């Protein structure tokens, strides 16, 4: 056991003994598709275990997910893109998402939009029936 599991990076603690692009999925905001796009563009091997990744290599992967548009990415494959407030396409990650999505729910309640009500009441929003299902 020269290597380390339980590796802390980007405010989460992603797993080791778990092959890289699945390991980066433990972060909120990088998922299975975008994780492959980082590693492919990292660019190394998806299969290699997050056991290893020697810190000079790891410092690359954090620079990619923070600066995606910059690092040779199409932008269609981004978490936010064209945000109304900033009017700019950059994609959210880590502990931000759980706090920053909450604002986009909170602002609906202040407006009294139809969505903002059904978040507050704890019901289904998108136009599902709730006669029988959801109890």
């Amino acid at each position: 056991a020269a290597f380390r599991d339980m590796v802390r990076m980007l405010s989460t603690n992603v797993d080791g003994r778990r092959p890289l692009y699945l390991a980066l999925t433990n972060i909120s905001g990088i998922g299975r598709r975008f994780a492959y796009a980082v590693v492919r563009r990292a660019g190394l091997d998806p299969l290699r275990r997050a056991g290893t990744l020697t810190p000079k290599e790891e410092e690359l992967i954090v620079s990619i997910i923070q600066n995606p548009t910059e690092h040779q990415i199409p932008v269609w494959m981004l978490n936010r893109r064209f945000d109304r407030a900033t009017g700019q396409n950059t994609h959210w990650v880590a502990t931000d998402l759980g706090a920053n999505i909450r604002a986009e729910i909170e602002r609906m309640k202040k407006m009294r939009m139809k969505r903002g009500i059904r978040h507050g009441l704890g019901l289904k929003v998108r136009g599902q029936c709730t006669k029988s299902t959801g109890r």
């Binding site: 064209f82 407030a85 009017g87 009294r112 939009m113 009500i117």
Partner: protein, 118 residues
């Protein structure tokens, strides 16, 4: 602190409807391309007139049936009587309610409140 697409309140008012609709959601610029004319034009005529007459108090209500109009910066801070199929429900417009469907703020149904047994 308010921006729409990294653009403040008055420069959205300055740039007019034609360039504005380049940066609505692509659900919504379909409604501007197809089926904008006549019914819609009267609205922003009438929401100009109630806005002009005011200057502390907020203006008189501009009643309207049609629920499926985009909210634009041009009519911010008007009052609108929006029909629920029942009553013209009245909403003073905020900056955060830009670029949305006008129906959303007239909810057609009651919340519920469940009682009792049966």
């Amino acid at each position: 602190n308010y921006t729409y697409r990294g653009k403040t309140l008055d420069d959205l008012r300055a740039m007019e409807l034609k360039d504005f609709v380049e940066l609505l959601p692509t659900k919504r610029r379909r409604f501007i391309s197809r089926s904008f004319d006549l019914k819609h034009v009267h609205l922003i005529e009438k929401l100009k007139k109630a806005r002009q007459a005011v200057a502390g108090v907020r203006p008189p209500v501009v009643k309207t049936h049609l629920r499926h109009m985009v909210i634009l910066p041009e009519f911010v801070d008007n009052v609108i009587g929006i029909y629920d199929g029942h009553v013209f429900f009245e909403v003073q417009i905020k900056p955060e309610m830009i670029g949305h469907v006008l129906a959303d703020f007239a909810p057609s149904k009651k919340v519920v409140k469940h009682s009792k047994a049966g």
